[PDB]
Amino acid sequence: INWLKLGKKIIASL
């Protein structure tokens, strides 16, 4: 899964 916080890392991942 991916939480709001986890998503930031993905949103940050370019």
Q: Give the technique used to solve this structure.
A: NMR
**What is the Cα Rg of the chain in Å?**
6
Q: How is residue 5 written in tokens?
A: 């916080």
Q: How is residue 11 written in tokens?
A: 């949103």
Q: How is residue 12 written in tokens?
A: 């940050």
The single-letter code of the amino acid at 7 is: G
Greatest CA separation for the chain:
19
